[PDB]
Design a protein around this ligand. Structure first.
Ligand code: K
Ligand code: K
Ligand code: K
Ligand code: K
Ligand code: K
Lengths: 257, 257, 258, 259, 257
């Protein structure tokens, strides 16, 4: 039972932070990148290296202690940080043609963010059920061929940063009543990134009943993926490249029964 | 004669489910994929195997037993499940260029969904009237050259899963008064998938008179196609890849005369 | 004519539902919905396309319930391209995209066009190349000059015959068509992907800025269409236009006029 | 100019309907609507395009019913359309096959679709890709160009006051002027970009500013301007020519009293 | 405390100007272009010359002295100047194919503008932390591998024209309360420019409380980047090409406490 919003100067708070991308970080110089992408010969032999696998980002943000009142998330401003880095087409890249600049970051992207009053709820789905996910990651267990389309056994919480690979988990549309999530997968090997920035855009997080995510235990959960595409090295080897995401959330106190 | 909506706590219900894709499933490891695509050498000799043909998906969901009242479908939330699986560019694929990642799923897609109070009504249309559709599928019978543009003999109901090939049937626009349907064919051999996910988007199913689909015999019909594109293996052979679709439908009791 | 009040009551509304088949050229008994393979002339001077290679506009004249002054006024339209999923047949006599791949799908230049009017669609002729010889059996801009490549006001016609007016040399005349509503999109490029949407939830309102729809002269409704979806490439590389049928549902009401 | 009330009554409205032909260069007696085939200089300093290779702005000055209280015709709405979009379906004439046995490559690549309605000539600012480009006799071009002309040289001010004379590539609408004109344009670059051309008789553009006032026609003349470079046509040899189309305009005007 | 707006003839003013692009200007004939782009052999050896690096544009515009009253920026009209120069495909470019016209300007673009009552606040982010930025530029200092995703040390003000390289700075979303900024990075090596011009479009600069940027010390700050793409010359070498941006801003006097 959601009751009235509290008013007064004391009745609002805001959270501001950024989430770093978790692309794999294959050495001490390659934060924000994955390891070079290799191709297994068969579905059966697919055994991706941990450093080759982008993972979901998550932060649990403690809010001011309330107690029954709960913090309600009302608005979000969000932004991908560092979009102009993609203008570095002069570093270790592959010339597009003789004497040309380096091919820029392009290809498959996944841009995703969520705000909730509890951990994002995940459903596991795998491209290839015979993929062996590596030690150090949290992945769909006991996968069967049905896991390639929908296996309801694969339920998890996004409760650990740099652990849940992007490719084998999505938000669970059968749950997540207390989260708002948004994402876009743009495929193709050459697809161009299109990255917009502005400080004038706000997303309202209220549902159809005028209620936003309610923060259980006075914690706010923010999640993100910003795989921007792949960087191609001079040899032609490709690595995922990601960027950080800014969040600013405005919250208000709501009485509940 | 549609009369008033019933109110009270007892007067609403919801259906939540998913429909798996039916892409052909050529072996025990390839759920969600078709058989590799082969090309006939003439129009006359076109004779696709069943496991090479994506089919429409359908589920008929029983609703709480009534009785006249009928359940009226009012809103829909829907989502393609497992969009991030398309980031697996590391297995059984063909490098985009020397030393690159595997070419991702791309090319022709068809994303389609419908919600109705009875089976989706279909009209048959064929690319090539001399195509021999295989045993175990339901296809336009007695096809003539006119069937390549419009032959009104080809009427059917989507009343069996894993049976009506996508390529030879479409929703019948002369019927379907009691269904709401939505589809997009995106062609081209290289077209990139663009897949959005969110739990914040609702489609209203009411017609211009404020009336949604009315569920005959207390059954709700959900139909879907989500052919995402084709997967290319190292040799260049291509197979369709599909994903499951989530549905959540809100219904209310309506009195009719 | 002064437009006066709309008539009401059960008897005052009617609806037309039909489909228009595409007229792509139909080069043999097996190839309804396709054109003949496209050949390229050596020079502008020698351009002489065969009739079976030229998509034409589709038109249907639909008789309405007899009136009488009352006229039927067309108010709304639902329309849809029929058979969009046929483009998923990439296993039939096509050219593989690469070694061992599926066939190249239908793609490239498309023209999707529809109109609803109370009289024939009015056409203006414009030619890519004024030296093109349009074939016997078509209706085309006559006495074409070099100015016909940009605008020659002599080239006026009515879309009054099916499978006769080639798409490439006629467009709706923007100086006329007061009693028609028309809509079209040319999407060019040899590789451009079709994007075809279907739904039974979309309605176009046909009323002008004064609240008046097309008024059906002689109790006839005119429907016109083109749905050239792109080109099909066969094994040899030869290309043919492929078209699809278009569904129309029009709601009409009786309107009194002076 | 104080803008006062609109006149009403049957006498107080008029309309202009016309078309503007494209001015692509017209290199011979058979090639109206096309430019000469494009050739490329070997250095910036030797860029010297021939007039027939250069698309120019189109303009028409349309006399209105004579009015002279001071009354002026006020342009209120516009309907506009590119004429002949389906000509781009001729892929069977003197073209270059896309692949063995294929149809001809259609018109594609860089396009500029532009139109304006004003109560006086469109005001232009000159900007050049390369300041050492020598524009040819019979065109009007930025004079005394310097290297700063490649980004902004305020000396280069002109009026679009002559048809088939102002090359498209070295002039744009001057955003520091044009108070009495409404203009709209889109440059879509790339050598392979597909034309996307929409036609309909159901679309109207309102020409009123934020104060409810449309272009006011000085001396009872209405100025219409356009460019509709649709892309390039590729001949069998590979040589490329710009192809343009005409533009239809219908403008509704009303009488407005001014002080 | 923002109080009432002043009214009357004297209470408004406007700024109209243009900002030239700062692409590098490698010689006396190449204003608006960068130096040809060269590619470093390794990430470690990336050492771009200043004339190869586009920089942010900025103008500080003095307003009529007020003193408490401040000028408040309310509306913006803006336009890229010279869009039709991209139609010069006859000036030492590289033919698209034998006998063809020159390839036009295409590939990565960044179009950005801002209006504020103080300098644009910047956050440094680098593609490659081992890039050595050149003398004469202002760049992220003490860069570490963390600078590739987010290093909060890299804070700056856009306070000097032709000095802050585009590729290593973005607007800081954690600041800029008194600025409105808007930008789009469109990547890919072949992406077509799409440039719209009109004198009929206005952007409102008021925030959700009805308050525009407030001009501290009676100065208005305008900033821009309009990298349109790369020009490829006959040799295959590629250079950035930029264009100027027009600004017209309307301001009103606002009382504050
Ligand atoms: K494995
Ligand atoms: K057969
Ligand atoms: K001829
Ligand atoms: K010169
Ligand atoms: K270095």
């Amino acid at each position: 039972e959601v009751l009235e919003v509290k008013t007064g100067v004391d009745s609002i708070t805001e959270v501001e932070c950024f989430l770093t991308p978790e692309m794999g970080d294959p050495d001490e110089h390659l934060r924000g990148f994955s390891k070079s992408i290799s191709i297994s010969d068969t579905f059966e032999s697919d055994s991706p290296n941990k450093d080759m696998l982008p993972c979901y980002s998550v932060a649990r943000i403690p809010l001011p202690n309330l107690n029954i009142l709960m913090w309600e998330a009302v608005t979000l401003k969000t932004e991908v940080i560092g979009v102009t880095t993609l203008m570095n087409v002069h570093s270790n890249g592959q010339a597009t043609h003789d004497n040309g600049a380096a091919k820029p970051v392009q290809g498959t992207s996944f841009h995703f963010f969520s705000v909730g009053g509890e951990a994002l709820e995940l459903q596991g789905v795998v491209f290839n059920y015979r993929t062996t996910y590596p030690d150090g990651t949290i992945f769909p267990k006991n996968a069967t061929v049905q896991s390639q389309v929908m296996n309801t056994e694969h339920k998890a919480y996004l409760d650990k940063n740099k652990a849940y690979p992007v490719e084998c988990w999505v938000p669970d549309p059968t749950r997540n009543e207390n989260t708002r999530y948004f994402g876009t997968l743009t495929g193709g090997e050459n697809v161009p990134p299109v990255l917009h920035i502005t400080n004038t855009a706000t997303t309202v997080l209220l549902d159809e009943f005028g209620v936003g995510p309610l923060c259980k235990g006075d914690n706010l959960y923010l999640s993100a993926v910003d795989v921007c595409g792949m960087f191609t090295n001079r040899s032609g080897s490709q690595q995922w490249r990601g960027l950080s995401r800014y969040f600013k959330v405005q919250l208000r106190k709501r009485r509940v029964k």
